[PDB]
Structures are given as C-alpha cells and as structure tokens.
C-alpha cells in the first residue's frame, strides 16, 4: 500500500472478475438452485484469483487468506449480484442470460425473503447513483473486514492500514465528484452501512445453504468447504 488512490482504484478495476454465464435455458423452467450453485462455484474460482490481486491481501499468510474468503465469499458474491442488477429494477441479474423476478424466487422455499433484501440493496445503489470505483472499493473492504475479528501474535494492523487506505481512496473519489466535505462523510457512512446488510443477507443466505445440504441440491466440492467453515 505504497500507492495513491488513483493507482489504488485502477488496480482494483483491473483485478475485476468477469461476468460469467449460467446454464439456464428459457425453454426449461430445485432446478433454479442448481443453476445458481454451478454459477457460484465458477464465480468462486475467479474470486480467489481476484482476491490475490487486491492490495495487501497476498501479504497475509495462507491460513488468514483462507479464513477471510471462507467468511466473506457469499458477501462478495451478493454485492456483485446487487451491482449487476443495479440498472434492472425489480430484477436480479445473476447472469446476462439469467435475469430473475420477484416471482421465480418462490420456486425455491425461503428464498423469497433473501431476494427482497437483495432487490432493496440494488434499489439503494440505484438511488445513491453508486459508481464502479466505489463498488470495487466496497468489495475489497468486505474481503478484508468480514474476518479479522473472527480470528506468534499476528499484528493485524496491516489489514487496518490497508482498510484505512481504502477509506482515503473512497474520500478521494467523492471529492473529485464535486461532493462537499459534509456530503463526503454522509456518503461514506451510507456506503458502509450497506455492508451491514450484505452481512445480514449473507448470514441468512448461508443458513439456507446449510439447510439444503441436509436435503436435494448437491453442492460442489468447493462450496461444501466454504460452507462448513460457517458451522
């Protein structure tokens, strides 16, 4: 983290994973949870390599990186989902070919509640007019923040040092957007209060996945290890 905010943003932008596709076929309407699982399983592989390109993350030990991902993988997926669906009111965009409704959420029991909060989050990004430079920052914050307090004697001040650097980066972004000093702290606060919802959605979601494991939705070999870390 010997890098300016502009260099910070660009690095996070270049590290961005692609938008993968699903195996969904319109001709064909449990089945939906299968698609999302296979989608998330392939998204994970990109997230893992994305996390490596996040400034400060690779400076950490292997055991610490494992925990930080184990605890935040669904948050990062969910905020990614919310960001893609930002310009699709009342709809969630899991993939370009997979745009879902507040009616197909009932095709899986108990998922309708999660969809609501996801849609509400998407509607919040829309109303706030969230920028991509801010999203890539929030994503990297979640990666570095969702763990830490769930943990020789470390010295985790490095993580907080990077976290403080990501904060200055966000402030730098808003200042260039013309926002006054007052408006900057407000937006800063509003943005970080979102993370205290993505956490909630993740927790609720995580517990729904642990329910299906006990059966009819066979999870991939990677998702099972990311799931057992939350029990």
């Amino acid at each position: 983290l010997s890098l300016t905010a502009d260099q910070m943003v660009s690095a996070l932008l270049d590290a961005e994973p692609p938008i993968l596709y699903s195996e969904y076929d319109p001709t064909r309407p449990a089945s939906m949870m299968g698609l999302l699982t296979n989608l998330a399983d392939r998204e994970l592989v990109h997230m893992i390599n994305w996390a490596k390109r996040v400034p400060g993350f690779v400076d950490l030990t292997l055991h610490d990186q494992v925990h930080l991902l184990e605890c935040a993988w669904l948050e990062i997926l969910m905020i990614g989902l919310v960001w893609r669906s930002m310009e699709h009111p009342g709809k969630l965009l899991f993939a370009p070919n997979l745009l879902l409704d507040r009616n197909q959420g009932k095709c899986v029991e108990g998922m309708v509640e999660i969809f609501d909060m996801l849609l509400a989050t998407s509607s919040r990004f829309r109303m706030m007019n969230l920028q991509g430079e801010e999203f890539v920052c929030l994503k990297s914050i979640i990666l570095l923040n969702s763990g830490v307090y769930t943990f020789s004697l470390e010295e985790k001040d490095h993580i907080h040092r990077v976290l403080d650097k990501i904060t200055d980066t966000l402030i730098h972004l808003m200042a260039k957007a013309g926002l006054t000093l007052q408006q900057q702290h407000q937006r800063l606060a509003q943005l970080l209060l979102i993370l205290s919802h993505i956490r909630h959605m993740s927790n609720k979601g995580m517990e729904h996945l642990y329910s299906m494991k006990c059966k009819v939705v066979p999870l991939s070999d990677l998702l099972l290890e990311m799931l057992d870390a939350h029990r």
Binding site: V45, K52, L62, V66, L69, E70, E225
Partner: peptide, 9 residues
Amino acid sequence: KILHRLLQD
C-alpha cells in the same frame, strides 16, 4: 482443502 490449493496455485 481446495481453497488452500487454489490460493497456492
């Protein structure tokens, strides 16, 4: 674990 391997790869 797979996560450890993919991070090591």
